[PDB]
Design an enzyme around this catalytic site. Sequence first.
Site, mmCIF file in Angstrom:
data_model
loop_
_atom_site.group_PDB
_atom_site.id
_atom_site.type_symbol
_atom_site.label_atom_id
_atom_site.label_comp_id
_atom_site.label_asym_id
_atom_site.label_seq_id
_atom_site.Cartn_x
_atom_site.Cartn_y
_atom_site.Cartn_z
ATOM 1 N N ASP A 1 98.842 77.616 -13.528
ATOM 2 C CA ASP A 1 98.942 76.183 -13.918
ATOM 3 C C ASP A 1 99.518 75.369 -12.798
ATOM 4 O O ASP A 1 99.996 75.912 -11.728
ATOM 5 C CB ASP A 1 99.762 76.027 -15.210
ATOM 6 N N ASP B 1 94.766 89.396 -9.843
ATOM 7 C CA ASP B 1 94.673 90.533 -10.749
ATOM 8 C C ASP B 1 93.392 91.313 -10.602
ATOM 9 O O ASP B 1 93.337 92.457 -11.065
ATOM 10 C CB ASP B 1 94.897 90.098 -12.193
ATOM 11 N N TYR C 1 88.502 85.402 -20.550
ATOM 12 C CA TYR C 1 88.417 84.428 -19.425
ATOM 13 C C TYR C 1 87.737 85.054 -18.209
ATOM 14 O O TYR C 1 86.990 84.335 -17.500
ATOM 15 C CB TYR C 1 89.830 84.056 -19.105
ATOM 16 N N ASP D 1 97.245 80.961 1.150
ATOM 17 C CA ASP D 1 97.045 79.790 0.347
ATOM 18 C C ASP D 1 95.562 79.427 0.309
ATOM 19 O O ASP D 1 94.979 79.157 1.332
ATOM 20 C CB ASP D 1 97.905 78.676 0.972
ATOM 21 N N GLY D 2 94.980 79.315 -0.874
ATOM 22 C CA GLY D 2 93.534 78.897 -0.882
ATOM 23 C C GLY D 2 93.284 77.482 -0.381
ATOM 24 O O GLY D 2 92.131 77.125 -0.068
ATOM 25 N N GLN E 1 106.541 83.273 -6.409
ATOM 26 C CA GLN E 1 106.575 83.065 -7.835
ATOM 27 C C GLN E 1 107.492 84.103 -8.477
ATOM 28 O O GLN E 1 107.743 85.203 -7.944
ATOM 29 C CB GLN E 1 105.149 83.250 -8.384
ATOM 30 N N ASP F 1 90.490 80.544 -9.843
ATOM 31 C CA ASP F 1 91.238 81.216 -10.880
ATOM 32 C C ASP F 1 92.736 81.119 -10.578
ATOM 33 O O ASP F 1 93.307 82.093 -10.028
ATOM 34 C CB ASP F 1 90.864 82.719 -10.908
ATOM 35 N N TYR G 1 96.841 82.114 -23.902
ATOM 36 C CA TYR G 1 97.096 80.880 -23.189
ATOM 37 C C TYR G 1 97.629 79.853 -24.206
ATOM 38 O O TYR G 1 97.204 79.863 -25.332
ATOM 39 C CB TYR G 1 95.758 80.348 -22.550
HETATM 40 C C1 LIG Z 1 97.084 85.571 -12.210
HETATM 41 S S1 LIG Z 1 95.551 84.661 -11.890
HETATM 42 C C2 LIG Z 1 95.318 83.901 -13.553
HETATM 43 C C3 LIG Z 1 95.287 84.933 -14.715
HETATM 44 C C4 LIG Z 1 93.834 85.377 -15.100
HETATM 45 N N1 LIG Z 1 93.134 85.997 -13.952
HETATM 46 C C5 LIG Z 1 96.242 83.205 -11.016
HETATM 47 C C6 LIG Z 1 96.528 83.460 -9.530
HETATM 48 O O1 LIG Z 1 96.650 82.182 -8.882
HETATM 49 C C7 LIG Z 1 97.342 82.461 -7.668
HETATM 50 N N2 LIG Z 1 97.659 81.263 -6.931
HETATM 51 C C8 LIG Z 1 98.578 80.278 -7.248
HETATM 52 N N3 LIG Z 1 98.559 79.393 -6.272
HETATM 53 C C9 LIG Z 1 97.624 79.759 -5.325
HETATM 54 C C10 LIG Z 1 97.274 79.195 -4.097
HETATM 55 N N4 LIG Z 1 97.846 77.975 -3.686
HETATM 56 N N5 LIG Z 1 96.330 79.755 -3.361
HETATM 57 C C11 LIG Z 1 95.825 80.921 -3.846
HETATM 58 N N6 LIG Z 1 96.110 81.554 -4.980
HETATM 59 C C12 LIG Z 1 97.072 80.942 -5.724
HETATM 60 C C13 LIG Z 1 98.551 83.170 -8.310
HETATM 61 O O2 LIG Z 1 99.236 83.772 -7.173
HETATM 62 C C14 LIG Z 1 97.934 84.089 -9.361
HETATM 63 O O3 LIG Z 1 97.831 85.480 -8.964
HETATM 64 N N1 LIG Z 2 97.089 83.549 -20.129
HETATM 65 C C1 LIG Z 2 95.904 83.421 -19.401
HETATM 66 N N2 LIG Z 2 94.843 84.099 -19.867
HETATM 67 C C2 LIG Z 2 93.689 83.976 -19.179
HETATM 68 C C3 LIG Z 2 93.608 83.206 -18.035
HETATM 69 C C4 LIG Z 2 94.717 82.525 -17.561
HETATM 70 C C5 LIG Z 2 94.644 81.758 -16.403
HETATM 71 C C6 LIG Z 2 95.745 81.076 -15.927
HETATM 72 C C7 LIG Z 2 96.946 81.148 -16.612
HETATM 73 C C8 LIG Z 2 97.010 81.935 -17.764
HETATM 74 C C9 LIG Z 2 95.907 82.646 -18.251
#
Ligand SMILES: C[S@@H](CCCN)C[C@H]1O[C@@H](n2cnc3c(N)ncnc32)[C@H](O)[C@@H]1O
Ligand SMILES: Nc1nccc2ccccc12
Lengths: 293, 293
Positions: free
Chosen positions: B171, B98, B73, B149-150, B40, B168, B237
Amino acid sequence: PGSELISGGWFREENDQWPGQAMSLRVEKVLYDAPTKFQHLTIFESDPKGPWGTVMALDGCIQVTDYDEFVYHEVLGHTSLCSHPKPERVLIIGGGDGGVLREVLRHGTVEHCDLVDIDGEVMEQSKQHFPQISRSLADPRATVRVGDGLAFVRQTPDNTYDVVIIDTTDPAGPASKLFGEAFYKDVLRILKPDGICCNQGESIWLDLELIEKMSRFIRETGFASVQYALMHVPTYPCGSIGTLVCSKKAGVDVTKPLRPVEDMPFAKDLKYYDSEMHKASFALPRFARHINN
Amino acid sequence: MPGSELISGGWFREENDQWPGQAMSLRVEKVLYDAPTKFQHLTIFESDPKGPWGTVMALDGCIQVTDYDEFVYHEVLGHTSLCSHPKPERVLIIGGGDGGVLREVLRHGTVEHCDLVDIDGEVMEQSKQHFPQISRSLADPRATVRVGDGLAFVRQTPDNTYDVVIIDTTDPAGPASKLFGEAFYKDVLRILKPDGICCNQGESIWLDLELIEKMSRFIRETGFASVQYALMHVPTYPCGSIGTLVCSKKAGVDVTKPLRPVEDMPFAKDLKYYDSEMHKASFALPRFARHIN
Ligand SMILES: C[S@@H](CCCN)C[C@H]1O[C@@H](n2cnc3c(N)ncnc32)[C@H](O)[C@@H]1O
Ligand SMILES: Nc1nccc2ccccc12
Ligand SMILES: C[S@@H](CCCN)C[C@H]1O[C@@H](n2cnc3c(N)ncnc32)[C@H](O)[C@@H]1O
Ligand SMILES: Nc1nccc2ccccc12
C-alpha cells in the site's frame, strides 16, 4: 457470545463459527447492549474517524453497519424480485432490521409483504438506531410479525407467495432450523408455481461444505434450480456472503435478470446492485464453481 | 508505521491509520520471523491450526499473503493481464517479491522472460524459506530477479521493452509511495511496447476510492487509451476485496473480455480462482464505484 466481545475500546468478532480470526471495529460509544428473549443484542457507534457508523451485532455477529448495509439488502431484494415475472406477494423470514423490506418495497408490483422475525427487539432497536434501514417497517404494504419463521411457514397455505427471502442470522442460534431441509420443503410448498426464494447463504471461504449440502437438498426437495450469488460485504466474515437463489419452475435462469432494474424508476437510487452486478454475482471462483455447475 | 507491537496477547491485529477504526485479526500459533529489513518491518507467523489461514506474512503491519487465499490475487493479476495481450513474451513485475504473480505468469507458454524487481531482498529470502508454494518460480531460468526500487528501474529501462507490466506493491504508506504516482506511470507507459498492457495493486473501493479515481484519471491523461478496474475477493485484504487497474496502451483493446481465453491453455484446470467467467465478472463494479472507469 455477548457483551464480552466489546473489549479495550473495540468490538471483536471472535466466534467458533470462524476459528482463529476476528474482524474488529473500534467503538466510540456503546448505545445498547442487552439480552433479548432470544439473542444478545449490541448496538454501538463506531469511531467517527472511520466510515462504519452505527453497528448492530446479534450473539456476537455483526449484522449491519450504516456504511455497507446496502449491499446485502439490495442483492437479496432485487436479485430475487428481478428474477420474478410479477412479484406481488413476498415473504421475508428474519429481516427484522427492515433492510430487505426497504428494497422489496421499491418494486411497484408488490401488493403485500409479510415479514416474520423471531426477535421483536430487533425491530424495536432498528427503529431507534437505524432509521434509514427500518423506515420500511411501518409501510401498510407490510405486515410485520414477531415469531419463529419455521412455525409461520408451517401455518401458511400452499401457493401463497411469489418470493420468499430468508434473511437470517448464522446457523448457531435461533436460525438453526432455517438452514435445514424440513424448512425448505415448506418454503417450496408455500411458493406459487413461478416462485423464487433466496437466503442468507454464508461464506464460500468458511462454510463451503454447508453450501454444498444445502444446494443439494434444496434441489432434492423439488426446486428446479439453485444458483449461488456472491457479493462483497466487508463486515461479514472473510468479506463476502452469498445467497442461494432458487426457482420452483423449470427452465428459469435466475443468473440473467428477467425484469431488469434499469427499466424501473428507482434504479439510480441503488448503491450496489444493477443488472451487470446481478450477472457477475453468479460467476464463482473455480474452487466453488460446482455449486452452480 | 507499525512493527512488532501488532502481535500481542496471542493475536495479530492489523491496526493501521490507512483504515482507521477497523482491524482484521488472526490468532498467532508461532512467530517465524519478526524484524526490520532495510526498508520495511517484516513479520511472518503460523496462524491458528484450527483456522484455515496457515502461514501469514505482513509488511509494515499490513497482511501481504496467507497460504489459504494467496491464489486469488496472484491468478487475477497474472492471467487477467496476460490473457488480454495478443502475445505476451516479455513481462515485468514491479514488487512481487513473494513470487506469486511470477508463478502465474510463467504458466504461460508465450512468456520468454520475466523480470521482477522488488526493493526488499528479505521478502524474497523469507518467501523462499516460509512460502515455498508461492516462491517456487523465483529461481526459474525464464525469470530474472533484482533487488531495487522499481521507480528507478522503470526510469532506466528503454522505451518499448515489455508486453505486460504488473505492479504488485504494498500500500502507499512505505516504500511503494511513488509507485502510486504520475511520474512512475509515465515511465510504465513509455517502457510498454505499443500494444502493451499493465495492471497494479489497485487497493480497496471501500477505503481508497479517492485515490483509485485519481489514478484512473492520471493514467488516462498520461497516454493509456483505456483503464478498467477489475475487483476480486481476498479475505485477507482490508474490507475483503482488492481491485486492479488494467490499462491498455493502445486503443481498440477491450481488456474486460479475454482476448486469449485461459480455457484454451493447458493449465486452466490447475487454477483455483481464475477463469474466463470470473475475468468478465470482475469488471462489473458496484454502482458507487462505477466512476472509476
Ligand atoms: C508482498 S507483495 C504484495 C503481496 C501479494 N503478492 C508487495 C511487494 O512490494 C514491494 N515494494 C514496495 N515498494 C517497492 C518499490 N518502491 N519498488 C519495488 N518493490 C516495492 C514490497 O517490498 C513487497 O515485497
Ligand atoms: N493481503 C493481500 N493479499 C493479496 C494481495 C495483496 C497485495 C498488497 C497488499 C496486501 C495483499
Ligand atoms: C438481523 S437480520 C440479518 C442482518 C441483515 N438484514 C437476521 C434476523 O434473523 C432473525 N431470526 C433468527 N432466527 C429466526 C427464526 N427462527 N425465525 C425468524 N427470524 C429469525 C434474527 O432475529 C435477526 O433479526
Ligand atoms: N454482516 C452481515 N452483513 C450483511 C448481511 C448479513 C446477514 C446475516 C448476518 C450478517 C450479515
